Write an enzyme that holds these catalytic residues in place. Structure first.
Site, PDB file in Angstrom:
ATOM      1  N   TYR A   1     -37.799   4.228  30.341  1.00 14.99           N
ATOM      2  CA  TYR A   1     -36.260   3.145  30.096  1.00 14.99           C
ATOM      3  C   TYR A   1     -36.861   2.346  29.212  1.00 14.99           C
ATOM      4  O   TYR A   1     -35.700   2.011  28.338  1.00 14.99           O
ATOM      5  CB  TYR A   1     -35.788   2.991  31.119  1.00 14.99           C
ATOM      6  CG  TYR A   1     -34.953   2.965  31.795  1.00 14.99           C
ATOM      7  CD1 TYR A   1     -33.005   4.003  30.762  1.00 14.99           C
ATOM      8  CD2 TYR A   1     -35.298   3.807  33.025  1.00 14.99           C
ATOM      9  CE1 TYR A   1     -33.080   4.450  31.372  1.00 14.99           C
ATOM     10  CE2 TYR A   1     -34.056   4.899  33.540  1.00 14.99           C
ATOM     11  CZ  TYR A   1     -32.935   4.884  32.498  1.00 14.99           C
ATOM     12  OH  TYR A   1     -32.262   5.931  33.650  1.00 14.99           O
TER      13      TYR A   1
ATOM     14  N   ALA B   1     -22.894  11.835  26.054  1.00 21.03           N
ATOM     15  CA  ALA B   1     -21.887  13.147  25.557  1.00 21.03           C
ATOM     16  C   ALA B   1     -21.888  14.156  27.369  1.00 21.03           C
ATOM     17  O   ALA B   1     -20.980  14.545  27.468  1.00 21.03           O
ATOM     18  CB  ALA B   1     -23.206  13.821  25.660  1.00 21.03           C
ATOM     19  N   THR B   2     -21.987  12.895  28.730  1.00 18.16           N
ATOM     20  CA  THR B   2     -21.556  13.963  29.850  1.00 18.16           C
ATOM     21  C   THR B   2     -19.857  13.203  30.432  1.00 18.16           C
ATOM     22  O   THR B   2     -19.787  12.431  29.898  1.00 18.16           O
ATOM     23  CB  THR B   2     -22.401  12.656  30.927  1.00 18.16           C
ATOM     24  OG1 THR B   2     -21.660  12.792  31.684  1.00 18.16           O
ATOM     25  CG2 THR B   2     -23.056  11.590  30.282  1.00 18.16           C
TER      26      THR B   2
ATOM     27  N   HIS C   1     -10.465  14.365  25.879  1.00 17.30           N
ATOM     28  CA  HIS C   1     -11.350  15.369  25.918  1.00 17.30           C
ATOM     29  C   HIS C   1     -11.293  16.491  27.230  1.00 17.30           C
ATOM     30  O   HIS C   1     -12.099  16.267  27.792  1.00 17.30           O
ATOM     31  CB  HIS C   1     -12.764  14.997  25.851  1.00 17.30           C
ATOM     32  CG  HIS C   1     -13.976  16.686  26.363  1.00 17.30           C
ATOM     33  ND1 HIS C   1     -13.267  17.382  24.842  1.00 17.30           N
ATOM     34  CD2 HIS C   1     -15.042  16.667  26.641  1.00 17.30           C
ATOM     35  CE1 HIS C   1     -14.780  18.189  25.316  1.00 17.30           C
ATOM     36  NE2 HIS C   1     -15.224  18.157  26.724  1.00 17.30           N
TER      37      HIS C   1
ATOM     38  N   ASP D   1     -14.458  10.803  27.556  1.00 18.02           N
ATOM     39  CA  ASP D   1     -13.648   9.487  27.176  1.00 18.02           C
ATOM     40  C   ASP D   1     -14.021   7.910  28.078  1.00 18.02           C
ATOM     41  O   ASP D   1     -14.504   7.163  27.831  1.00 18.02           O
ATOM     42  CB  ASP D   1     -12.294   9.473  27.194  1.00 18.02           C
ATOM     43  CG  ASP D   1     -12.099  10.818  25.690  1.00 18.02           C
ATOM     44  OD1 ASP D   1     -13.022  10.188  25.041  1.00 18.02           O
ATOM     45  OD2 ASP D   1     -11.368  11.785  26.229  1.00 18.02           O
TER      46      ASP D   1
END
Lengths: 305, 314, 314, 306
Positions: free
Chosen positions: A67, A113-114, A170, A118
């Protein structure tokens, strides 16, 4: 001392790994670091990705990382998560992830992306405290690109001179913007009347778009190549300051009769991130289709915020 | 066929799918057909690869098909086969894969195919030789990935050691794709300066440092496998690289699996040597003047391959 | 400039304009400023180059300016100067061009410029040395086009002789850019195979054929000039190639004009040798082990340059 | 046997030479042959162009040649001609000799016309050659439209790819902007004009710069060639690579825009077959009149010669 483009990828599953392979094959970033709770997998993936390094079109330094390696990243792309129940798990996963990233001194752009994209994009904006222009979700970019390509075939032109968006959440509530779909300047409705180009022919194209992902999953259990490609495309618009119009997950405050919600609309994307929201004059069907979609989302939101 | 390139992939596992993804990402071919009896997984991959086609630099038509769809392919790339089980010898793996290749190649030839074969399945030099025998094609039109991956890596690392572009560096790994492959130190050179000279006259450049580059190249696959279970991205890239050299008539020199009849003192064997690759396949074989150590290593490497071929071919 | 590459061109004649056109056609730089006291012609060219910018692969901002606009340039490329008139000696041309370069370089330095100089004006090795002296910059940051054009054309033709990609062919022309430049046959190789070996092992490969590849390289400019009055497309391309190696940090090995202080037995002279070119300019010098004939030719070539420098520099 | 892309260039002046240098720099064709009445100049150019061959992104074989060498050309690009309505007169003649010599070689490809006045000489080439109208193409207003398009992606702040705007009609003073269909990301220009204050006469001056761009270049250095060369290479690229790109090339109309029997600039789909379709914009009242007036001007100049 010229700027070095750097991407940090979080989650080396099928989406993340493929996303990495795409960045490398397209020569999109200068550096890429891969981070996953499963150290050995991320480590193996990095090694495999570097195995064929000599064949990449452009030099790209790919490494395993943690990280803290996000500090000077231009982009942090989050592909990690689990695959109302699911929204709970992922909401928490993201909390710890954004927390760890922000703790490293990262001051770039988040690419989410996951799924649900939204929702998790809204969340990321909240958890990170960054300006809303610098938290970006993949939204409906994939579905819109497809819609756009199918039409350049159908009407016989290059995708470059063909216009068509898919906007909204989406998901099943996403919608086509027929009112503004045009070919070389010529609106679709015009071409449909003047020829017998028939209606539910174009309607079927929209049908395929929305169910594309379900059909893929039905056959092999997960979708990843198309997703990876949309991510690499968005990453490209950012790193190379393109000002490309993409229907990414964007924060709205009044633009489409919606406020306080991340949702899919055509937005200009550049090195700063969201550089403006394209405001299409929706007709009557589209206007309510959209607000219904924004409402569905905001509704899942409040119980958590 | 005239204005458009077409690749047929046989075997849609991790290697094959990644190769497909690489071709699409780099814009190498106009058409790809994917062939695999595992229909759900392969059609799934094809649909997935088509899902994001709009983002690729060039239009690419991807489809699911079978042998009949090879008729107009420029290249048939074979990634199908079994992988060798722990405890199984290579001759035992070869017995299984030859039977698989016998069916695949005869079906491909019977479709009307008249292009080039690109072989990826292990042991690649053996199966390339088999594909030549099974197909009845000219030896120039049957190509295996050979040591291309290990060479390119070897060559990048030297570029990333002596501090110059890959393009300006010369370093080959030759021999069987496996543990007997050898570096051609005698011809390794930067900007045209022999590696032995560079070593001699700069003590920032050490021998064991260089040998270590060789140790790592040869064990890279095994280490990836340790941590991830299998290896496929590198293989896929090497295959995409060879495919590009063919489809775009590059005349690139690559250490692909190549048929030798006398060169380097080896006969009747497919094995990794620097060969000119273009649209017709193998356009020429680079014959390096090996030193005495290299010559012995190379003939041993050719011998190891012939020990496997002998029980299966006359 | 942080995310943006910028080139300043000084001199908008046929060479400079073609260079500009090449940069734009290849997508090499983000910005170009053109500097030339001949305002009408130069602004005309700038407007003409901008007229078709929409068709270029990448966005390119082209403008007309003067020395002050070099402040944030990564590269200043100098094509300005007089050309050798018939009956005039090179020392006479050098006297005129040194005066011109003295004004240009001091004005550029006074703008705040802190990049790399790329010198194209004839005699290029001499004017590169002068630009180094006049600028007070590190020698690594002053580059001349050297023998890059003749080398590339030496190396393509061989590639188009032995039947392989340029990328796998090694052949350098080194020395002054002019009649004393020499081929390094001793290190010329294909896929790593010495040219001398290829020659004596195949009778289709013959010496005189190779030698005339050399005589043709050296007379190419003169023949173009005979037929069209001047030469500029090749020069423009060589400059675009060097610029690309710099702006994109390639570490490409190119026979640019380079300062030697002992290498190859030459001192205090800029001259064409294989050098690694990247974003910092000269990253390293390739020292080929010249044979006895080559060594003599090269020291004579360095001597011809020093005979010109000596009356002008202590 | 993969198809070899071949371009034959006629006229190695500033436009042709630059057009060649562009094809080489962009890696657009596999082969290029150069043909000019001035043999020594064409020979010189070819030599200069090959001088730097090793640096070209892609292999391209460039050579000197004659009309006979057009036989297997995919494209014949004409940049020859003289540089006063008698200019049309001298050029009409030159083209007659040129097309006749080209067709006499067995050429069965596509003509690309750049010599001005381009609309007129594109019509002529179609007549002299006898080829289908879809295979004779003029540069038209492609350059002006490309400029207009970019000069708007900056103004409104998006990528040119997401912007739509054409310039149509004759290549000249009678050319006109198609404001009614100019859109950004889907959003028509008119909408953005009054909804933010993007000012009207500002977008207007952009159309003025476009139309006079070439005159201003000529005022300063005597001729334009770089921009022209770039537009030619772009059209050549749409053809050789079967792009189906929409370009406002010089196209034969028969009723499409209230115009018939005339070559004029309109958005046409361009691919390896040449013109593949004519984009039909719903012109508003203003535009409809500007256009027909432009077609009339042209058709008028054609009559005396056909």
């Amino acid at each position: 001392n010229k700027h070095v483009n750097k991407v940090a990828l979080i989650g080396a599953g099928f989406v993340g790994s493929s996303y990495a392979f795409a960045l490398i094959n397209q020569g999109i970033t200068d550096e890429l670091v891969v981070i996953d709770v499963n150290k050995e997998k991320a480590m193996g993936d990095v090694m495999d990705l570097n195995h064929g390094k000599a064949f990449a079109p452009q030099p790209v330094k790919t490494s395993y990382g943690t990280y803290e390696d996000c500090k000077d990243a231009d982009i942090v792309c989050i592909c990690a998560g689990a695959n109302l129940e699911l929204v709970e798990k992922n909401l928490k996963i993201f909390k710890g992830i954004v927390s760890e990233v922000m703790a490293s001194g990262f001051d770039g752009i988040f690419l989410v992306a996951t799924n649900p994209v939204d929702i998790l994009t809204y969340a990321t904006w909240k958890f990170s405290g960054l300006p809303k222009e610098r938290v970006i979700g993949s939204g409906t970019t994939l579905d819109s690109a497809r819609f756009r390509f199918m039409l350049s075939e159908y009407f016989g032109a290059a995708p470059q001179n063909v216009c068509a968006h898919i906007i909204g959440e989406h998901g099943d509530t996403e919608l086509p913007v027929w009112s503004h779909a045009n070919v070389g300047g010529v609106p679709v409705s015009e071409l449909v009347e003047k020829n017998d180009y028939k209606q539910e022919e174009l309607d079927q194209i929209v049908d395929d778009v929305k169910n594309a992902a379900y059909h893929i999953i039905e056959k092999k259990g997960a979708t990843y190549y198309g997703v990876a490609m949309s991510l690499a495309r968005i990453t490209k618009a950012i790193l190379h300051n393109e000002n490309s119009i993409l229907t990414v997950s964007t924060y709205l405050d009044g633009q489409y009769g919606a406020d306080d919600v991340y949702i899919g609309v055509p937005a200009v994307v550049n090195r700063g991130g969201i550089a403006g929201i394209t405001e299409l004059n929706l007709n009557e069907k589209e206007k309510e289709q959209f607000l219904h979609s924004a409402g569905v989302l905001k509704n899942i939101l409040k119980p958590h915020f």
